[PDB]
Structure 1
Amino acid sequence: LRRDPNLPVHIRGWLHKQDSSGLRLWKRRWFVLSGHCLFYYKDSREESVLGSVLLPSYNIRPDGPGAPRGRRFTFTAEHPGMRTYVLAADTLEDLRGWLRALGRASR
């Protein structure tokens, strides 16, 4: 997907993303929610999209108490047959803003 430079941004910032190789590593990426799409980049320069998600078909849920994935404040964006995004915020307030924005984009 392509980002429209003109479109307002609902939220952006760092999140850790778990990889999908099966070794379950994390990599810090810079995410941007614009329109109903999530984009991520190498860093906050927002130069060259490295990945993107069309959110209207996705469901996004927090992973809940207990740091089950080995870090706090994780949440999962999923839809069967589509790539799962496993994400971690740095704080609770961070988590709140992201879950709000992703919920609106997916509804």
Structure 2
Amino acid sequence: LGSPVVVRGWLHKQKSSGMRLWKRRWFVLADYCLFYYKDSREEAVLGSIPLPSYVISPVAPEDRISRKYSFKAVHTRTYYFSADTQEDMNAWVRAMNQAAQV
């Protein structure tokens, strides 16, 4: 992946389209970049989100998100994520913000 892994695990990512359905992907944060894969084998990169100029935080009421442990990355296009526990969400928010500072 070029760089040592800071953190990896499952997140649901919301689709940006009208229905705003969720899809579970396996994320890996390396250097300043978020990479995701179909599953935890990390075989083929499905996508990369470079994090510089994003700020990551828990969702607000006006985001209208009904999944628990949800957080968002907004530019200085917005991405909505949901973790499976409070702890994992807290760890992703800290890690994504660290990566977003170069």
Structure 1-normalised TM-score? 0.86
More strand by share: 2
- Corresponding residue for residue 93 of structure 2: 99
Matches within 5 A, 1:26-45: 26-45=22-41
2:42 matched residue in structure 1:
46
Q: Distance in 2 between matches of 1:22 and 1:86?
A: 14
Structure 1 moving runs of 4+ over 3 Å = none
Q: Tell me whether 1:89 sits opposite 2:83 in the alignment.
A: yes
C-alpha RMSD of the superposition: 1.7
1:56, CA displacement in angstroms? Answer: 1.1
Q: Secondary structure at the match of 1:56?
A: coil
Give the equivalent residue in structure 1 for 2:18.
Answer: 22
**Aligned-residue offset at 1:68:** 4.0
| Aligned pairs, number | 100
Instruction: For structure 1, list consecutive stretches of 5 or more residues without a partner in the other structure.
Output: none
Is 2:71 the counterpart of 1:75?
yes
Q: Distance in 1 between matches of 2:48 and 2:78?
A: 12
TM-score with structure 2 setting the length: 0.90
How far did 1:21 drift? 1.4
3-state SS of 1:53 partner? strand
